[PDB]
């Protein structure tokens, strides 16, 4: 109504306990100690190419990130799935099927060389 | 930092729309003592909010300038051709 | 088949004389090699069933189930030594012996050639399961469970025996090959109607059909985990397999008496699913879900359509795997809490992330998320039923809906919430159970990749 | 539908993020000058969603409206189209009146912030998308439906004045 | 909605019902007309596989437009004069359609005349 | 006034408009006090078990097993085949039975009298 | 405990004016109407008959419930908002940290050490606090839901550990 | 924490706004404006119709073709 | 936001209550009971408690709305509820 001293004594006793527990929740300088780990020499070279602080070196560090991205993420697919298509998938009937392109009058077909015959005059309307 | 709040004596119900709230409610026989809690909303840079047509209008001046210079350029090119 | 029978039989002396510590390791590993040997049995000729001998033969229906049992046998061994750690060595060895005898009887059942031998081993699976359910059970109505299970099975089994011996006297032989090649049309005589009922009702009791399905919510819920998974995963498939064998000499009569039971399943799969929704225990929910899936398999069987048979077989395999995994997960949670109400321990997704996953795709496969073999097996039956009768779809369409509800409901109410504060015995996930759910899950997606194997003899 | 809706969606996410995760409209206001980038993103999201001419947004809806006007349809069928465009404009201006316009209605602690490269980059990608992608696709793709030529003018412009009323 | 009002609210037979109209032969009433010519040919018609909806009397301008546009890349702003031509030719055929509509409409007025003017004999 | 929301099956009377909390009586407040007393006891010993450092496993809850046993065990022993019970059994368990059988059989025979008379589509139905 | 009339009108004022905030939306409207409703409340505090005062409360609650907002505002973290129970998926019970593997324990060493001394606090406090709640228990069954204090010095107040070691407001 | 992060809390005051983000906001608004006015001038015929609607009552009876109304 | 602190949230509450006209600048104190030290009524205490509810973002529980009176205990409940510990 009501924060009675009987209930107060509980409340700030629980306060000092809760606060000290929260100080304990705070970590320490050694926290978090991380067990020793091996580091490959290539990323040693790359972090030394990152430490110098030069603009061009940071730019080419990230473009080599992008380059390894290209080779191992967007180049090996056009490797493998093209290997799969042109020699395995396309080698079997009807696996790959393409509609005949829209061939308009006055268009030359590569194989036959004939130009599709032209059509009669347009009504020559004008607005 | 310590997060130094500004002095209270500049967050005044005066200079805010709450005046039409206060005296009107004073006419009703009461008084508004919580008004200047919101005084910062009606004061400072937050004041004089733009209208609806003004809200949609943002960037129309430079757009009109680009319009007129672009049509001048295309008038020049078609005159030359 | 003695390249699989003889090693299974000789597996008994190994456990029965192994040391106090080597029984589990030896049984697990050698059962794994047995499963590896039975993996060969997936080698199937185009249309001719592989007839190893006069008394043993296999085709594209018996072989997947046999591989399922043989691959399963290590799984009970891995799931049992948790609740079997504090036992005498002789008692543990006998538990293992019950499991091996069960697997052996299932192998002879699936590879049997004469219908009478099939009946002998099919029913003979009761005894080891009875011992497992009764002696090693932990709950109260386990003693009642054994009585209910045995009597429900036998009440159908004996009329089947009378019908089989009558067929032997009349037709000439109970051999599958003879009764199929020398099959004769069945007249619509009422004595023939009762013969069909005798030949059908035993398997439909073990199916189970709606109504006379009370032995599962009172048997699987009570059995030790190993017994529970061997029951739900394969012993339910016994009735379906037997029906697939027996409908060869049960036509064209079936259709006229297909009307009562079919819808009995079709309607029943709804109620069981609804019963799943308002459950209190995990194991009972899984049991009722098993009843509904097996009822769908019943419908597939009585349609007698090629597509229905293929979808049926796929559903049997997928349901066996999923039900075994779900029971194992329920046992893990129950043992961690020593209770089975699905409200006592909720919000354990955070505490056990790998259990959270295992439950997630266990539910997904139970919910039949495509293109899992569960979904394709269900959908083939749905298409066959729609071809047989259109309206079925809405009932079918209801089922997974309600299924989906409970298929996620327990996951919402056991891991997707807030943990209970007063409980603290939930320890770090012992990698035994996580690995066990792995050996449950990876074969499921592997068979999903190539479902032509579990597709049955109609493929 | 992807462009302007995703736009005002992550703009809404931005305003929620700035105001210590506060969502209900009655608890922010006067954020027009407080943040001009998200304000521009919001009113341009409406500027595409409501489909004023010559921007990605309209490159469907006007024709859409034309499609329902010049066709064999039902009275309610087109009535809900026009009235729903009007309703859409209603809360389109309602939300800008709440959040950025009006007087501040957010808690006293002023943490409205936009200074993040990811946020600005992500919104500006869709900004250019919602300003020219509709033009790109519309002028590019071959005509897959015979365009409706000369027709009574009263149902051509109907879509715009219902939005504005 | 004018003719719609005159048909629904007023006389249904007064306005052309959208399905059957014209209910009178084109040669009858209208001075002897001529079967609308085909600039486009069937072989060219399916050579570009135009959709059946865009397979009208007017499709010659569209096939020429696609002939230019397929040869006009990346310039998507070009071929404006030919699409304007197709728009005007669609407008011409739409004028033909409303001419059929008003032909049915006015011949329906004439039909009403023939009916009740002759019926006044009673 | 705007007439009061009559309580629904899925929404009870609002706690704001409860007459009992308004026209209170000494016995009403007494009946509301000793519930607080027993609830205080129930929170107390729960806290003692819950704050016991050596508490391991689960604090077994009698009420939970009471619910489970009531909804799992007592249902049949307490069941008496009253006329209402048998009526509900007939209406639910076996009621929709004839309904589904009738509709399915009607479709089956109606279609059957369409194949053998040739009045159905069979051109591309070689899979069933 | 029991809901006295002053409590039933304090809750009434809270609900009515928060719903009025949801209604009027704008802050100046809210201020004007809130002062007006404050007057409308305090004008007739002098209802001598408690039955008559409860009847006026009947009318007030009736009209407020008829006119309460169809979408009253609730802040997110508070019960009913968008952030309500949204952080439960992050908080983990404290006893889980007795489960961490010795590698996991040593990788956070001194926090485990201070958990060890807090655990020692819990052990040394359990018997003291149970006898403390025993000596001041309401004779023959607890009477009120209140919680007994640490009247003496150094005793951890009875039933303290879970409140003290409660998952923080923002575990993250 | 964020000790001295770029954005500074301002108790009940207008917060700081680096002129960059306002100038790009006006950049974007001016661009969408200029875009719609330029395309308005270039292609107004798209939005007001290339050809007006041919009202039918004004049509005569010759091109409309119906036989003499006094037949 | 940076970790809220006892004296910072104390500063916010003192500004918003000294801000009240009924609480003139002079009778503001760290021990300022709303009934006796400052003369406000229960209705007034609920007004100021709900103004707090609005300007802090958090929502007071009804068990605390009718009973949180002195700014010491007021800022104390704030410290406990939002884990304000420093
Ligand atoms: C829907 C909104 C818009 C439309 C709104 C339209 C009007 C809605 C109703 C407006 C308010 C209503 O008249 C009065 C009511 O809230 S209740 C009845 C009076 N009954 C008492 O006042 C109890 C007795 N008195 C005390 O309990 C103490 O005197 C008190 C706590 C009040 C003062 O504090 P003291 O320190 O104890
Ligand atoms: C003039 C502004 C109010 C709206 C007037 C009606 C606009 C829509 C007309 C659609 C007519 C379709 C049928 C034709 O005739």
From Swiss-Prot, chain C:
Q: Which UniProt keywords are present, listed alphabetically?
A: Electron transport, Membrane, Mitochondrion, Mitochondrion inner membrane, NAD, Respiratory chain, Translocase, Transmembrane, Transmembrane helix, Transport, Ubiquinone
- Recorded catalytic activity of this chain's protein: a ubiquinone + NADH + 5 H(+)(in) = a ubiquinol + NAD(+) + 4 H(+)(out)
Location of this chain's protein in the cell: Mitochondrion inner membrane
**What GO cellular component entries does it have?**
mitochondrial inner membrane; respiratory chain complex I
Q: List where the protein spans the membrane.
A: 22-42, 60-80, 98-118, 147-167, 193-213, 224-244, 257-277, 284-303, 308-330, 351-371, 391-413, 435-455
Q: Which GO terms describe its biological process?
A: aerobic respiration; electron transport coupled proton transport; mitochondrial electron transport, NADH to ubiquinone; mitochondrial respiratory chain complex I assembly
Q: Subunit comment for this entry?
A: Core subunit of respiratory chain NADH dehydrogenase (Complex I) which is composed of 45 different subunits.
Q: Which family does it belong to?
A: Belongs to the complex I subunit 4 family.
Fetch the PANTHER family from UniProt: NADH-UBIQUINONE OXIDOREDUCTASE CHAIN 4 (PTHR43507:SF20)
Q: Which NCBIfam families match?
A: NDH_I_M (TIGR01972)
Q: What is this protein called?
A: NADH-ubiquinone oxidoreductase chain 4
Q: What is the lineage of its organism?
A: Eukaryota, Metazoa, Chordata, Craniata, Vertebrata
From Swiss-Prot, chain D:
Q: What does this protein do?
A: Core subunit of the mitochondrial membrane respiratory chain NADH dehydrogenase (Complex I) which catalyzes electron transfer from NADH through the respiratory chain, using ubiquinone as an electron acceptor. Essential for the catalytic activity and assembly of complex I.
Upper lineage: Eukaryota, Metazoa, Chordata, Craniata, Vertebrata
- In the record, which residues are listed under signal peptide? none
Subcellular location per UniProt equals: Mitochondrion inner membrane
Q: What name has this protein been given in UniProt?
A: NADH-ubiquinone oxidoreductase chain 5
- Which part of the full protein does this chain span, and how long is the full protein? 332 to 496 of 606
Q: How does it assemble?
A: Core subunit of respiratory chain NADH dehydrogenase (Complex I) which is composed of 45 different subunits.
Please report the organism this UniProt entry assigns to the protein: Sus scrofa
The residues that cross the membrane are 1-13, 35-55, 76-98, 126-146, 151-165
Family stated for the protein in its record:
Belongs to the complex I subunit 5 family.
